[PDB]
Amino acid sequence: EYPTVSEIPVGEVRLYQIADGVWSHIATQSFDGAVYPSNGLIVRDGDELLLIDTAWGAKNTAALLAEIEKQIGLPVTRAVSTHFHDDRVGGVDVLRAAGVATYASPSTRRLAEVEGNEIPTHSLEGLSSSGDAVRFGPVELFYPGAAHSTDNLVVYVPSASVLYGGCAIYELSRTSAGNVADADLAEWPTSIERIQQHYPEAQFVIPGHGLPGGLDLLKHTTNVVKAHTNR
Ligand SMILES: C[C@H](CS)C(=O)N1CCC[C@H]1C(=O)O
Ligand code: NA
Ligand SMILES: [Zn+2]
Ligand SMILES: [Zn+2]
Ligand SMILES: [Zn+2]
Incomplete structure (x- = not known):
């Protein structure tokens, strides 16, 4: 469904x-x-909402805010972008104009600036080293190491056992590598293993593109990455 x-x-x-x-x-x-x-992702934080990632562009992100208001009816007060690409920060200006506080790691903010992309306002500390985690409202943010990009973060909702992998995790139906221009292929499998090690109890795993599944998406991604590595 x-x-x-x-x-x-x-x-x-x-x-x-x-x-x-x-x-x-x-x-x-x-x-x-x-x-x-x-x-x-959208996570309820008392009587407010935490948004993870934009909806890939200004028009989609405006639509996202309208849909959230219509269906949920609680204010989005903060948003975190999980890496610097346009499906994560494209729409940040829309969020900011709507009064949403926007956040990303300093690594993401730097890379977004270099790319000429939109730049979240606030800098997240404590995520600069592989294996670093910090709590952010109702979620944990985790830097597993370089993978799909050097800055990619994953997000865990402990109340719900939901792991949001972002674009570091591929859906099962993706059989070959996606956009790897900014990837660290050499580190990607190791970074995935850090996610498995830190969130072994995850019940739902959401990839950045496509259908959710369970923790099998991690090994799946490793397999696709290693096949690409050996092309
Ligand atoms: C914008 C996203 C960021 S992970 C992307 O790179 N895509 C999404 C569609 C295909 C591929 C590309 O542009 O090469
Ligand atoms: Na943790
Ligand atoms: Zn990306
Ligand atoms: Zn602010
Ligand atoms: Zn993506």
Whole structure:
């Protein structure tokens, strides 16, 4: 029942309740003539919401805010971007204009600036070394090491046993490597192993693109990465 890329027109956003107080958000964009989905997360924080990642662009992110207001009706007070690419920070200016406090690691902020992307306002401390974790409202943020990008973070919701892998974790249906231009292929498997080690109790694992599953998505990603490595 997870919404698929064929059931969301570009410009629209769907929410999917994963567990009590936890949703993913799903949006789409076209790339090179194909249509791709992208996921983020929404976590209830008392009477407010924590947003993880934009909906991939300004128009989608405006739609996200409208959909959250319509369906949930609680204010989004903070947002965290999990890496510097446009499916994570594209829409930050929209969030900021709407009064949402935007956050990312200093590593993400630097890379976004170099790329000419939107730059979250606030810097997250305590995430500079592989294996570092910090609590952020109702979630834990974890830097597993370089993988899909050098800055990628994962997010865990301990109340719900939900692990949001972002773009460091691939869905099962992805059989070959995606965008690896900014990746550290050599470190990626090691970084995945850190995630497995730190969150062995995860019940739901959400990739940055595509269908959720369980912890098997980690080994799946390792397999695809290692196949690409040996191309
Ligand atoms: C914008 C995302 C960031 S992980 C991306 O790179 N995509 C998403 C669609 C394909 C691929 C690309 O642009 O090469
Ligand atoms: Na932890
Ligand atoms: Zn990316
Ligand atoms: Zn602020
Ligand atoms: Zn992505």
